[PDB]
Structure 1
């Protein structure tokens, strides 16, 4: 049966930024772990945020707050400026 991983999107993104470069298989497992750790931290914090405010859904703002808590510094104001591109394009 199928096992499923993020392994292709990290490779796709590598060819976005370093078109000559590659990854060893052992160094893929790192990205395939890291990328789902940050998934869980955002899901867990966004879940608590909905609960504290006694909502049921989790709209964009329930995540933009979870990113603006969880990320340390310039990464917060960058990631917030990056995600507000994506939904602004999607809703056209």
Structure 2
């Protein structure tokens, strides 16, 4: 078993260095992250079945209609900045 508590903990720590967490909230965040991941991933799968064929454009477009546009543009922009950082 590999939990995801460490990553959310360090994200909270880099956005709030003196705010604690509760155990129920840990499961809340874990389930939120998991089900959002699954939802967007099956959306990407159906978008791959969308095109008459067997990348990152599919996931960008999938996040582009699943969640409200205001946060969607920030999501795609920061994802692109992340892949540019990871490119080299």
Please, which runs of 5 or more residues in structure 1 have no aligned partner? Answer: none
**What does residue 17 of structure 2 align with?**
19
Separation in 2 of the partners of 1:67 and 1:12? 24
Whether 2:53 is the aligned partner of 1:78: answer no
Please, which runs of 5 or more residues in structure 2 have no aligned partner? Answer: none
**What does residue 41 of structure 1 align with?**
39
Q: Which runs of 4+ in 1 moved over 3 A?
A: none
**After superposition, what is the alpha-carbon deviation per residue over 1:72-92, rounded to whole angstroms, capped at 9, x for unaligned?**
131111101110111111111
Q: Specify which structure has the higher proportion of helix.
A: 2
Separation in 2 of the partners of 1:10 and 1:22? 12
**What does residue 69 of structure 1 align with?**
65
Name the Cα RMSD after superposition. Answer: 1.0
Q: TM-score, normalised by structure 2?
A: 0.93
Q: TM-score, normalised by structure 1?
A: 0.90
**What does residue 2 of structure 2 align with?**
4
